[PDB]
Amino acid sequence: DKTVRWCAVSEHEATKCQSFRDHMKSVIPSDGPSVACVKKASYLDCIRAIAANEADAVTLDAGLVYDAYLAPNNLKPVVAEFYGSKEDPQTFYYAVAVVKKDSGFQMNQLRGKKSCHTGLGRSAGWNIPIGLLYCDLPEPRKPLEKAVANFFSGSCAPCADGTDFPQLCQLCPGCGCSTLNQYFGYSGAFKCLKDGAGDVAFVKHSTIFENLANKADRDQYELLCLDNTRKPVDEYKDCHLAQVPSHTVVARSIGGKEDLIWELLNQAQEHFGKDKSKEFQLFSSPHGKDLLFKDSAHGFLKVPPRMDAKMYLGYEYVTAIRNLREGTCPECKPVKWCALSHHERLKCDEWSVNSVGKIECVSAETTEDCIAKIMNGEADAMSLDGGFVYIAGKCGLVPVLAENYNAGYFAVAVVKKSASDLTWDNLKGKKSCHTAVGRTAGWNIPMGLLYNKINHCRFDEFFSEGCAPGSKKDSSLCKLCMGSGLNLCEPNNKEGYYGYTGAFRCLVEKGDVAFVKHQTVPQNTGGKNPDPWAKNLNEKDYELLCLDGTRKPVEEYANCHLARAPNHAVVTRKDKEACVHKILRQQQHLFGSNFRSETKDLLFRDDTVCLAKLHDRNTYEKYLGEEYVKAVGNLRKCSTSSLLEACTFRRP
Ligand SMILES: [Cr+3]
């Protein structure tokens, strides 16, 4: 049946679950979804019941979202409660470390400072900061309060054991666990900072705004970023200890009924949600507060499919709570490289052994899966087209090293010379060949500039037909692709018109125009490419389209290009930046131009001589450049990316 077994953890919850079930029966057709109510003793029993296939769904705080994803439960987030509005939905809060302007210390210098905590046991004010700080704490690290009391010179930790650890109540004698304590709760711990008692205050992004109405006052405060720099208090999105989901419905990963759950809760919110004012109300109960959902919720949002627990919680949160849960601290260490194929994996393997392990290897099925592994620490680095750096960026990773091949490569529009009528100005109703959608040369530049002419990104209705791997299988821009069966129109090397070369091949065989890079025609003409399609081609038979409306020969790309290409680039997490720079330059200043593939273009492109420091352009926005970014923002209206949908769900 189309039935969601909801798990309750109390008699009151079970009663609301039953009223829920009975009221849904009135609003939903026989073919629609229904509720069953299962009552357990605790959130952990509910997690186990759901994993046992005795229940389907429960709503959890972020600590329990974490418990629920660990084996053997293997549960994941499927629906989010949201608070206030739509344009701004407040699905998450941010744990931040607030400090005074000019106190002159960074996160890696908290040892010896005076800390303000909302309350011992609370997330923003204790579990996250002490989680992150866990391994800077002095041995022995158990009992944990003792070790915290031995790290901050003094603190106000509400509800800590002041009697056995007085240092923790220096700033609030007694450690009062109630509002009768002036330094308790979010405003308490902030007040503790303001009133000059302490140096740092572990609170949420929003506390300072709730407690200081005038910008002038807030300008006297900053945030500690995990990168050991500071930022103003309204830049919390880029400077926080952890991003925290407020209330999260979870299911089984495999066969969890995610879709029924969403269908149920969505019709549940249209009929019974905020301000719908029926006798039954999803977000309150005469039986008690916060039953089955927070009473403060304004609705539900579907969790994007690509999302797992580790990505929903995010790197920073998992790090903090995994330290807290496991309590495991160590002794630069290996760079885990991510391979996209058996060819990349064998190359990476031989790199590992010819480098004393200073390089380890971990492989995944697509670029997006690899990126997702770098986000969450299963992996550390991989080199990416401009288009994928944008995604890796929106997903919170930074570029460290660019690939160099001599400002980098040039995106050019190639035509067959004989069709001399063809011009950049009018390609309407002509046949296009792109490397893949969301790549620099193939799409983001060409279609970038194109979007500007036609105020829309529905390109399968500008071009007659084409080959643009990563397009929807039933699009006019998959009709020229050459892969057979499931591989037709895939953006991997099982589709022969994939990449710079494929797209040129596409032009040779089927299309009018190919969007590729300046050295692509030369490398696959004159016999340099021996493959049947390329072998007998002559460079002279191909021209480039120039912006002004004219044409020029291939080798004349200097004055006939569409735009300069952001070079391909290695990317990693901010916490790995330093170490990737160190170990790759120590690998390339040994195995550089002393980058060769048993196949072709493995790991890094084969025409790659050195890996350049970026100096100051170590952000996706500063590395890709202002104009490249505007373009992709224009193109994401029509983008089909499952990772970016997940990443932008956590950061619009
Ligand atoms: Cr590229």
Pairing of strands 569-572, 382-384: antiparallel
Tokens 């046949």, located at residue: 431
384, β-bridge pairs = 569
CA 409 distance to own-chain centroid: 27
Ligand 1 center–CA 617 separation, angstroms = 18
Number of residues assigned to the chain: 652
- Class for domain 335-406+566-649, per CATH? alpha beta
Q: Residue 315, annotated ligand binder?
A: no
Other Cβ atoms less than 10 A from the Cβ of 326: the count is 9
Angstrom CA distances, 603 to 56, 262, 345, 371, 481, stand at: 42, 40, 9, 14, 25
Q: Residue 125, annotated ligand binder?
A: yes
d(CA 363, CA 344): 8
Q: Which are the contacts of 62, defined by CB distance < 8 A and separation ≥ 6?
A: 123, 244, 245, 248, 313, 317
The residue among 173, 167, 202, 171 whose CA lies nearest residue 185 is 202
Q: Residue 61, annotated ligand binder?
A: yes
> Is 261:56 a contact under the CB 8 Å cutoff?
yes
Q: Residue 550, annotated ligand binder?
A: no
d(CA 181, CA 179): 5
Amino acid identity of residue 291, one-letter, is L
Q: Residue 221, annotated ligand binder?
A: no
Q: Which are the contacts of 221, defined by CB distance < 8 A and separation ≥ 6?
A: 98, 99, 100, 101, 193, 208, 212, 233
SS (H, E, C) 227-270: CCCEECHHHHHHCCCEEEECCEEEEECCCCCHHHHHHHHHHHHH
Q: Residue 234, annotated ligand binder?
A: no
Q: Residue 218, annotated ligand binder?
A: no
Q: Residue 124, annotated ligand binder?
A: yes
Pairing of strands 410-416, 398-404: unpaired
> Is 564:547 a contact under the CB 8 Å cutoff?
no
The tokens of 492 are what? 């991997």
d(CA 648, CA 652): 5
The residue among 166, 136, 171, 318 whose CA lies nearest residue 245 is 318
> What number of CA atoms fall less than 13 Å from residue 502's CA on the CB side?
25
Ligand 1 center–CA 205 separation, angstroms = 38
d(CA 611, CA 607): 12
Ligand 1 center–CA 441 separation, angstroms = 6
B/e letters for 162-186, b = 16+ CB within 10 Å, e = fewer, are beebebbbbbbeebbeeeebebbbb
DSSP secondary structure, 524-570, as one string: TSTTSS-SHHHHT--GGGEEEEPTTS-EEEGGGTTTS-SEE----EE
Ligand 1 center–CA 517 separation, angstroms = 8
Element (H or E) spanning 309, and its range? helix 309-313
Q: Assign 3-state DSSP to the chain and report helix, strand, coil percentages, each to 5.
A: 35, 20, 45
The residue among 469, 537, 542, 536 whose CA lies nearest residue 500 is 469
d(CA 419, CA 422): 6
> What number of CA atoms fall less than 13 Å from residue 310's CA on the CB side?
13
Burial class (CB in 10 A: 0-12, 13-18, 19+), 206: middle
Domain ranges of the chain: 3-90+247-316, 92-243, 335-406+566-649, 410-564
d(CA 425, CA 63): 57
The domains spanning 92-243 and 335-406+566-649 adopt the same CATH topology: yes
Q: Which are the contacts of 130, defined by CB distance < 8 A and separation ≥ 6?
A: 137, 144, 148, 324
Element (H or E) spanning 367, and its range? helix 367-376
CA 84 distance to own-chain centroid: 24
Q: What DSSP designation does 334 have?
A: -
Between 258-272 and 11-27, two packed helices, what is the crossing angle to 10 degrees?
80
**CATH code, residues 92-243:** 3.40.190.10
Tell me how many degrees the CA angle 620-626-631 measures, rounded to the nearest 5. Answer: 95
Phi-psi region of 251 (alpha: psi -120 to 50; beta: other; left: phi over 0): beta
CA 331 distance to own-chain centroid: 30
d(CA 474, CA 449): 25
Tell me how many degrees the CA angle 407-413-418 measures, rounded to the nearest 5. Answer: 140
Ligand 1 center–CA 389 separation, angstroms = 10
**CATH code, residues 3-90+247-316:** 3.40.190.10
The residue among 380, 288, 422 whose CA lies nearest residue 16 is 288
Pairing of strands 513-517, 432-434: parallel
The residue among 615, 610, 613 whose CA lies nearest residue 405 is 610
Ligand 1 center–CA 193 separation, angstroms = 49
> Is 282:79 a contact under the CB 8 Å cutoff?
no
203, β-bridge pairs = 96
What superfamily does domain 410-564 belong to in CATH? Periplasmic binding protein-like II (3.40.190.10)
B/e letters for 603-625, b = 16+ CB within 10 Å, e = fewer, are bbbeebebbeebeebbebeebbe
Q: Residue 500, annotated ligand binder?
A: yes
B/e letters for 372-411, b = 16+ CB within 10 Å, e = fewer, are bbbbbbebbbbbbbbbbbbbbbbbbbbbbbbbebeebbbb
Pairing of strands 335-339, 359-363: parallel
Tell me how many degrees the CA angle 113-118-119 measures, rounded to the nearest 5. Answer: 100
Ligand 1 center–CA 440 separation, angstroms = 5
Between 62-69 and 43-51, two packed helices, what is the crossing angle to 10 degrees?
30
Ligand 1 center–CA 360 separation, angstroms = 25
Ligand 1 center–CA 553 separation, angstroms = 22
d(CA 423, CA 434): 17
Q: Residue 442, annotated ligand binder?
A: yes
d(CA 106, CA 229): 6
Q: Is 624 helix (H, G, I), strand (E, B) or coil?
A: helix
> Is 9:46 a contact under the CB 8 Å cutoff?
yes
d(CA 138, CA 162): 19
> Is 325:128 a contact under the CB 8 Å cutoff?
no
Ligand 1 center–CA 408 separation, angstroms = 10
Tokens 């569409």, located at residue: 562
Q: Residue 542, annotated ligand binder?
A: no
CA 231 distance to own-chain centroid: 21
